[PDB]
Each structure stands twice: as C-alpha cells, then as structure tokens.
Amino acid sequence: DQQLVDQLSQLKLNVKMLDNRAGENGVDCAALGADWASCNRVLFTLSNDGQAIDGKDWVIYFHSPRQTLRVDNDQFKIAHLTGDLYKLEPTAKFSGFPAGKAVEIPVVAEYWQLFRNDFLPRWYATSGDAKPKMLANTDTENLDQFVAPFTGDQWKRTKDDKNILMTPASRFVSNADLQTLPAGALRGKIVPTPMQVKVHAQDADLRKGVALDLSTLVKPAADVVSQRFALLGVPVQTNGYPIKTDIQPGKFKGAMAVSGAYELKIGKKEAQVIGFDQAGVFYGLQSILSLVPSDGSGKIATLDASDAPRFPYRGIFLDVARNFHKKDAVLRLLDQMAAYKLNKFHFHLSDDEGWRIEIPGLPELTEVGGQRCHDLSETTCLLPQYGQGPDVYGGFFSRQDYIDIIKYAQARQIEVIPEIDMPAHARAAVVSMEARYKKLHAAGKEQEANEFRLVDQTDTSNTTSVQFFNRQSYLNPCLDSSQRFVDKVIGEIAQMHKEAGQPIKTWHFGGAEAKNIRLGAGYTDKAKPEPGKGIIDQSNEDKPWAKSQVCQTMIKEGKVADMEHLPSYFGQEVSKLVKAHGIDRMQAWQDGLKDAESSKAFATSRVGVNFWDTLYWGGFDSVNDWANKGYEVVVSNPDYVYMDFPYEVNPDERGYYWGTRFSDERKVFSFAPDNMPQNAETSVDRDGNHFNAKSDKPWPGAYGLSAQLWSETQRTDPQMEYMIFPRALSVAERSWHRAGWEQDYRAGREYKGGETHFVDTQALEKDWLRFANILGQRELAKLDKGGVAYRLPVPGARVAGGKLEANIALPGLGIEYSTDGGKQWQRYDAKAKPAVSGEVQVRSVSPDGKRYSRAEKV
C-alpha cells in the first residue's frame, strides 16, 4: 500500500563501482550473456534510517544504460521492462530492510561503466494502487548524492587501457604545451579563420557606436546583426563608425564564388562588407563582431580580408527526443551558431523515447509520444526512461513554436533540417499510433483507427534494438498505413516550413541501425558456445519483421528480396514520398542506405549521408566509397564530433563514450575531416592507443561537417549547453576553415600514429594555441553574454618549490585556488605564484566572474 511506498521512498541509495573488468577477474561474463564476455560488478546499497520495511508487495524501478545480468543478494531479483527501465523486487527469501541497517545488493551488469554519469538518478518505488514515489536522495542531478566516487583504476575499460586519467597533475601536462599570448599577439584574428587576411597596424575605434548600412539584408537578418552589436557593447548610431554593405556575386571567382562568401575591409574611419549574397554580407558582419574585444574597449584591428566556406554544410545536430530541450535553449543555440557561421540545424525531433513536434491530425504523437510517465499500459504516456522520475516528464514544440524556430534560424542564415527516424528508433510514433488505434477502435471507427497504424497485428518477431527496446521500436515498413503515416508527417512539417518562409531542402529519415542486436557478433548461441562471447539462446531471435506477415507477402510478390533488405527498401520508398512533397534532397545515417546500389537508387536528385564510422575501425577507408557512390558525405564521426561524449577522461565528467573516451576543444579542432587518414598522426583511439590509416581509393571530397548533441544524459538545458559549448566553436572553425596543416588526401599514404611524421604538427599546435587563446581571452566572455551554460575547464596544476603553478586548456581564463579545502578562494597570478602547503584545490572562473568550473584537489 501507500505506507509501503512511503517507507521505501525514504531508503537512501548508494551506488558504488566494484569492478569494471569483472571478466578479467574471474566472473564468467560469457555465461551471463554479456556481449563479448565483458561485464562489471556494482554495489547498490539501500540504507534505512527508519523502522523495518517488511512488506513484500513492492517493486522498485530504476534506469540504466547497461543491462543487469546477475543479482548477488538472494533476497532480491532484477528484471528488464523495455529500453533503460528495470525493476528490483523482493524474492521469496526477502526478510525486509531492517531498521537502521544498510542492505547491500551487488549486481553484475553488461560491459563497463567508466563514468559516474552512467548511473541514472530518480529510482522510484511502487506498491499495489499506491502512487509511485522516488527514493528521495536520488531525486537530483547531483550524482554525489547517491554515486560514490571512483577510486584507483576503476576508470579503465581494460587492463591495457592507455587513456590518461585527467587530474590537476596530469591535466597540467596535457596543457603544458600551451601558454597565454599577449593581447598584442591576437590582433585582427577573426573566428572562424578567414581564407585570406592582412592586418594593418591600426585600430578602428567603435566605442562611440557604429553606423550600419544593412539595406542588403532582409529586416529579420538585419535585426539579428544590430542586436549583436548591442549585446557586445557597441552602440548603433547614425553618427558612429560607418559600416557599409553591398552584394555583388560577380566580385567573386573560383572557390570564393559561393554562398556566404564576402570581402571585408576595416579601415580606421569606415568599414566595408561586400557579399556574394545576403549570407555573405551577414557573415562579413559576424567577422567584424568576432573581433569586438571583451574589455569593452571597442577597438578592432584595421585589416583586409577575403573569406569563403570550405563546406556549404556546417551543421550542429540536436537530439530533443531522448530528453526535451526548451525553445529558448534552441534559440540560444541558433544565436551562437550564427555568431560562428555554422549554417545547418539538424533537428532530431523523434526517437524511441519521445516525439517532439505537434502534427495536425495526429494528436497522439504529442499527447502520448511527447511525455513519459509510469503507465505500464502506455495509453497516456510512453514508459519512463533516462532518470527523469516516474511522473509526467516531457514537452514538445507546438506548430507555432516550430514555425517560430524556423523563422529564427532563417534570419540567421541557418537551414533547419528535420529528422523523423524510421524505420528503427520509432518507438514513440509506434506506441502513440497504437494508442490512437485503441482509442478509435473503441469507438468502432476501425478505418480511422487503422489509417496510420504502424504495427502489423500478426507480427510476433523477437528482436532487440541497440537501446534494448523490442519490436515496437521498429515502424513496419511494409504497411500501407505506415506510408500513410510518413506522408502525413512529411506533408504537415513541410507546410510549417513553407509558412515559416524556409521550404524544406532536405528531409532526414534517420536510417539508424535496424537490426536485432541479439544476432550480433559478440553474442553466441547456447547450443554451441564459442569462447569470449555472450552466451544466449539465439533459437528464438529473429531479424526485424521476420514474423510480420505483411512483410512476408511483400517479399513474396517481388517488391523486396528478403527481410534483410527491408530497411534499404524503406529508404527508397521514403525518398519517393520526400520527392512527392517537393523536397529534392534526402539525408540519413549511413546504415539506412548501405544496402542501396548507389545514389541513383533514390528519387531525390541529392542524397546526403551522415557518415559515422570511427577511424580506428576503418572509417578512413569506408568514407571514400560513399562519395564515390554519389552520396554527399556529411562528416559526423563519433570519435571526434559527437558532443554527447566527454570533454576529458575523468569519471566525474558527463557523456556517453562508446565511440571514443573523450573529445575536447583541442581534439575537435585537430580533426581533419577531408583527409581522414591524417588523423592517425594527431589523435589516439578509444583506448588511447596509436592507430594507422591509409586509403588507396579515390576521394572526391566531403560535402560538410556536422557535430552531434545526442541527449541520453543531457537531462536539462544547462547540461545540453555544457556539452555543446565551448567545443562547438572548434566545430565551427574546422567546418569553415581548411588549415594549412590539413593535407590534401593522397591515395596510398599510410599515416602511422607515433611513427610517421607527414603532418605539420608544429603548424597544428601553433594554430590551436592561438585559437584556445581567442576562446579564453575573448569569445567565452561573449558566451557569457549569450546566456549559455558552457563548460569551464578545470585547471591543470602542480606544486614546485612550494608554490602553485596553474595552467588551463583555454588560456586567458581566470584561475582560482583554495588552501582551506574550498572554503575561501583566491585569484591565481602566474607572475606571483602562491606559496602553498598541504591540500590545495583549483577551479577556473568565467570572464564575467559569475560561474566556476568544478573544483579539484591538486
């Protein structure tokens, strides 16, 4: 009853990693069904400061990105619901949570959990008809309340992991090659770096305002510029320092004759921006804005520049489906994107755990798909996921909200690319359409109920997606109703784009991995075990839709060759619908198009691919084939531009890490997207090891670059901003500028990490030093003004001769230190290092002095 839920809600949870490499230390992970025989042991401790909890009629629900394989306290048992949702229950041996006692429940989980952020908050208790209530100490974003610190080598994935744990001591080394440059050494440095620029000794003076001739821009775009001068402290007045604008395409030739190109002259009494087009004028103005200093001095260098995109597609991807992000955060994101010339906003509006766009005619997509709550019947919500608690959690963009975002993006030269995943990663749609089916069927409106249904009633397939959902994660690609659904959705969103003044150019249909993970290579069948693989019963595992009778008949009539080809087939069909709706470009994650012959297989005249192989797994060679088959490659490599991954290897950092252990501003910046093999000399793999890379194939070139904020653990808007910024500035730099150290691709050139010296690292490090300093001494202050909760890097620090030496990943940022265990903080001055003894802590401070990085012991 409710009293039982009450008692359980007051149990205090503690989560403690015991062994991240349990298979290396005896546990038979293979027998437990762990992928590649890899598993970890964790201790869940439930402490009871109240009276005995002896009731047996209860379930405790919790979330985890890892499956639970074994429970080592025989009073309890754990089962999986679907996705990340699990349940802990008493067994027949349960004898209660004794008064004033801590109950230990050791468990084994698949893989490893290398960051504390793996452990999700908001466990909750239930009991016959009572209402669900969270275990209170878990109702928080502060992991310290319920997750013990990692100790020793618990951060290591394997005994041979070569990654470097970051602490003040090791981080000092990681930063040592850097230094703070004098303001005089950073004059006329536009970000992103301009193609050609000549800075002159003198500075224009903008302190008395500027006179802006913005007649070349449509009003909304002009307003964006005017407002940014004001945000940056530069008055806009008719008697200010002139800034003239003009548009003349003919003035541009060759590679410079492209949208966004401009010519810029900053003189000591006036300024001039000549654009290839409106975007070019706009970017020319952003460059002037990038020079505005953070000291309010208003002085910028006189200079002469010519500038143009290396790539037409400079993207930022944002997942609002796993966890929602409010309209105001999207707008802030779009503001910074404009500031750094990123022009493409790839909007991941649906996935298995949420559907975030209102669709006229299909209310259930947002009424049910737009929220998660504990309703085991998923009639009013999707099941809870991602540690947001058992109560209703969610949100979605109204039709007006969405039109508003498109207008906002467009004023800023950013194109909105809507992504609606299918056939995989569609659980929100499927479950919502099942609720619609059920509701309309109840009223006896069977044709209306079946109009948009995404389930084949006959399908009993047994498949598991990458996030551990079942067949409901997959929309059925063989139903006429599924095509009615896709048509309806494209139709509705395209109309919003037309009303917002930016007709869709590209439709992104997802195309994520649509396979049953239980048939993957790391699992083995129980009949005949092969060592080192997770032993499971594969005799009832199917391929997606294998038991769908509609698909079976579709194959039989000759529409599709077999079940394996359904995903490919579905992508060709979506392309027809995209085209039928007047959209002539389609885009997808690579898996959704791999089985296609080439780009000629699609109805649209252009097909883009979000290339997401890692390099250490051969992505430096598989990328080629995509361009050579006629697809436009949007470089989206997870080992460099997945912004849901950690900034640094430290178990207190946020992020998933399946593709690599960390990607900091420096790493993102060091990535050479158009000569993938060269990255072997400038980066290490997921385990910190050197790798080699070479391709013998032709490489026509990449179409664009895109960085991704997936949102599994970015539960709040602040967390989203911490993960995106400031590394998205590095993304903008590389997306816009081809550096000298980025070599032309050479078929047959083999780069060997730690062995070959083809790459001009001297030039790379100098470029990075200057960029880091621009971020530290100037741009982060602008991010402050923008209201984005960017990540402040923790200092690097060491004690030598009894004094503190500190350094930072983004030189220019203030560093503070504390000798009293963090009670009182003092400014660190490099040219007057402090004498210290005993425990010392360090932290960095934002330019406006209001925010701090986390603090760490030296």
Ligand X SMILES: CC(=O)N[C@@H]1[C@@H](O)[C@H](O[C@@H]2O[C@H](CO)[C@@H](O)[C@H](O)[C@H]2NC(C)=O)[C@@H](CO)O[C@H]1O
Residues that bind its own copies (CB under 8 A): 152-153, 164-165, 167, 169-170, 173, 177, 179-180, 182, 185, 218, 248-250, 257-259, 277, 311-312, 498, 503, 579-580, 582, 584, 598-600, 602-603, 605-606, 627, 630, 632-633, 698, 700-703, 754, 762, 766, 769, 798, 800-803, 805, 829-833, 835
Beta strands in 276-326 (DSSP E): 299-307, 313-319
CA distances from 487 to 420, 484, 828 (A): 12, 5, 61
Instruction: Give which of 509, 628, 479, 483 is closest to 571, Cα–Cα.
Output: 509
Sign of CA dihedral 434, 436, 439, 445: negative
DSSP-derived secondary structure for 472-523: GGS--TT-HHHHHHHHHHHHHHHHHHHHHT---S-EEEE----S-GGGSTTE
Residue 179 contact, options its own copies, ligand X, none, Cβ 5-8 Å cut-off depending on partner type: its own copies
Residue 603 contact, options ligand X, its own copies, none, Cβ 5-8 Å cut-off depending on partner type: its own copies
Shortest reach from residue 555's CB to its own copies, in Å: 24
Shortest reach from residue 455's CB to its own copies, in Å: 29
* HSE of 101, CA atoms in CB hemisphere, 13 A: 12
Shortest reach from residue 710's CB to ligand X, in Å: 4
Residue 466 contact, options its own copies, ligand X, none, Cβ 5-8 Å cut-off depending on partner type: ligand X
* HSE of 386, CA atoms in CB hemisphere, 13 A: 23
Shortest reach from residue 712's CB to ligand X, in Å: 6
Instruction: Give which of 699, 695, 703, 694 is closest to 628, Cα–Cα.
Output: 699
Residue 206 CB partners (closer than 8 Å, separation 6+): 234, 240, 241, 292, 298, 299, 300
Residue 512 contact, options ligand X, its own copies, none, Cβ 5-8 Å cut-off depending on partner type: ligand X
Residue 821 to residue 802: CA distance in whole angstroms: 18
Query: Looking at beta carbons only, is 57 or 744 nearer to its own copies?
Result: 744
Shortest reach from residue 682's CB to ligand X, in Å: 22
Shortest reach from residue 35's CB to ligand X, in Å: 9
Residue 758 contact, options ligand X, its own copies, none, Cβ 5-8 Å cut-off depending on partner type: none
Q: Which two tokens stand for residue 265?
A: 């002259």
Residue 185 to residue 576: CA distance in whole angstroms: 55
Residue 376 contact, options its own copies, ligand X, none, Cβ 5-8 Å cut-off depending on partner type: none
Residue 65 contact, options ligand X, its own copies, none, Cβ 5-8 Å cut-off depending on partner type: ligand X
Radius of gyration of the chain (CA): 28
Residue 753 to residue 459: CA distance in whole angstroms: 49
Query: Looking at beta carbons only, is 90 or 776 nearer to its own copies?
Result: 776
Q: Which two tokens stand for residue 212?
A: 């802006």
Shortest reach from residue 313's CB to its own copies, in Å: 9
Query: Looking at beta carbons only, is 386 or 699 nearer to its own copies?
Result: 699
Strand partners, 796: 807
Shortest reach from residue 470's CB to its own copies, in Å: 37
Shortest reach from residue 616's CB to ligand X, in Å: 14
Query: Looking at beta carbons only, is 378 or 419 nearer to ligand X?
Result: 419
Query: Looking at beta carbons only, is 513 or 584 nearer to its own copies?
Result: 584
Query: Looking at beta carbons only, is 354 or 571 nearer to its own copies?
Result: 571
DSSP-derived secondary structure for 531-575: TTSEEE-GGG---TTTT-HHHHHHHHTTSSSSGGGHHHHHHHHHH
Query: Looking at beta carbons only, is 63 or 453 nearer to ligand X?
Result: 63
Query: Looking at beta carbons only, is 180 or 538 nearer to its own copies?
Result: 180
Query: Looking at beta carbons only, is 632 or 644 nearer to ligand X?
Result: 644
Residue 644 contact, options ligand X, its own copies, none, Cβ 5-8 Å cut-off depending on partner type: ligand X
Shortest reach from residue 640's CB to ligand X, in Å: 13
Residues that bind ligand X (CB under 6 A): 65, 466, 512-513, 589, 612, 642, 644, 656, 658, 710, 712
Q: Quick check: 627 and 633 in contact, CB under 8 A?
A: yes
Q: Which residue has the tokens 């030039």?
A: 763
Query: Looking at beta carbons only, is 79 or 173 nearer to its own copies?
Result: 173
Kindly provide the b/e burial profile for residues 735-770, where b requires at least 16 CB atoms within 10 angstroms of the residue's own CB.
bbbbbebbbebeeebebebeeeeebbeeebbebbbb
Residue 304 CB partners (closer than 8 Å, separation 6+): 197, 198, 200, 264, 265, 266
Residue 79 contact, options ligand X, its own copies, none, Cβ 5-8 Å cut-off depending on partner type: none
Q: Quick check: 842 and 827 in contact, CB under 8 A?
A: no
Residue 52 contact, options ligand X, its own copies, none, Cβ 5-8 Å cut-off depending on partner type: none
Residue 658 contact, options ligand X, its own copies, none, Cβ 5-8 Å cut-off depending on partner type: ligand X
Q: Quick check: 315 and 327 in contact, CB under 8 A?
A: no
Q: Quick check: 669 and 733 in contact, CB under 8 A?
A: yes
Strand, coil or helix: what is 199? strand
Calculated CA dihedral for residues 404, 406, 411, 417, nearest 10 degrees:
160
Shortest reach from residue 249's CB to its own copies, in Å: 5
Query: Looking at beta carbons only, is 670 or 773 nearer to its own copies?
Result: 773
CB-based closest residue to ligand X: 512
Residue 736 to residue 190: CA distance in whole angstroms: 12
Residue 109 to residue 41: CA distance in whole angstroms: 6
What's the start-to-end Cα distance of the chain, in Å? 50
Q: Which residues are catalytic?
A: 513
